[PDB]
């Protein structure tokens, strides 16, 4: 072992290599594995698809402004339109997978900032109006980032999610969000963040279009900054890889 700060990951067809990174946080202490034949209840045979599904699908990018609050994604839904993971997701009826989340954000030695890369299992949300429940087009984007705000929510539109960043939108203390697995991105000494998450859920296999497994949240606790005479555009990107996929219950598409 020489020069700890360099990693390398070759999963299937893609490879992501960082030179300046921290350690790798591996789930709750387990590596994602297939489903044993002692805990299954499906009566069909599964379908370990290919290397063609365990790949590195990169999602959209965004700009880290100087007033931005935070973004998030829904994991089983963000990869709905990507390659052969989005075809075996809708043609079948069941499935279980694990992911390998990644994040890139690189700045010079004259910038500053921080971020909290964390994934929350079973993330709920709260509508703006108390009586109603949130919409769907205001809860999940089509692999495009959803963003928090500074003002709380207003009183509209009776279905919008409440983007109150200091409460996280779930109704908890934002400082206590370090229980779920995570990693910090400090531009002083960091350039990325890796996270390996297994499949955590009550039932053995669950639908993909009806119930979202996890939720990826990004929150900058310390805003960007820089003196005059430097690049004012700092973008962010994320790369995710389905790990150990399986399916059951073949039907027509939807």
């Amino acid at each position: 072992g020489y020069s700890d700060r360099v990693r390398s990951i070759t999963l299937g067809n893609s490879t992501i290599t960082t030179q300046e990174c921290a350690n790798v946080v591996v789930g709750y202490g387990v590596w994602p594995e297939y489903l044993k034949d002692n805990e299954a209840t499906g009566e069909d045979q599964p379908t370990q698809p290919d290397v063609a599904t365990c790949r590195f699908y990169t999602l959209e990018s965004v700009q880290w402004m100087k007033n931005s609050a935070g973004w998030w994604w829904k994991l089983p839904d963000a990869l709905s339109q990507m390659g052969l993971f989005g075809q075996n997701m809708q043609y079948h009826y069941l499935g279980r997978t694990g992911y390998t989340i990644h994040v890139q954000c690189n700045a010079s030695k004259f910038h500053q900032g921080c971020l909290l890369v964390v994934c929350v299992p079973e993330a709920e949300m709260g509508c703006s109006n108390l009586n109603n429940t949130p919409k769907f087009a205001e809860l999940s984007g089509g692999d495009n980032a959803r963003m928090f705000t500074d003002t709380e929510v207003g009183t509209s539109n009776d279905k919008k999610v409440q983007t109150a960043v200091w409460n996280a939108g779930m109704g908890v203390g934002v400082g206590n969000l370090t229980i779920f697995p995570h990693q910090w991105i400090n531009l002083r000494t960091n350039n990325s963040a890796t996270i390996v998450m297994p499949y955590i859920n009550s039932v053995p296999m669950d639908n993909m279009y009806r119930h979202n497994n996890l939720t990826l949240m990004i929150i900058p606790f310390v805003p960007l900054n820089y003196s005059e005479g430097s690049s004012p555009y700092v973008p962010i990107t994320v790369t995710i890889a389905p790990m150990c996929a399986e399916y059951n219950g073949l039907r027509l598409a939807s």
């Binding site: 700890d4 350690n23 946080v25 709750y28 000494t189």
Partner: protein, 56 residues
Amino acid sequence: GAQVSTQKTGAIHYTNINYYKDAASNSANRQDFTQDPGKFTEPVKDIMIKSMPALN
């Protein structure tokens, strides 16, 4: 089936019998303590000793 087990002393024994068919009629398993902190604190892949520096 009676077991003569230990008690909770500050720093003896006490008998016990079950009388029903099911398993939901017994008492709680209060006298059981099992700890493992490694799952939540230190979930990293590479093991880190506190003597060596953190990042190289």
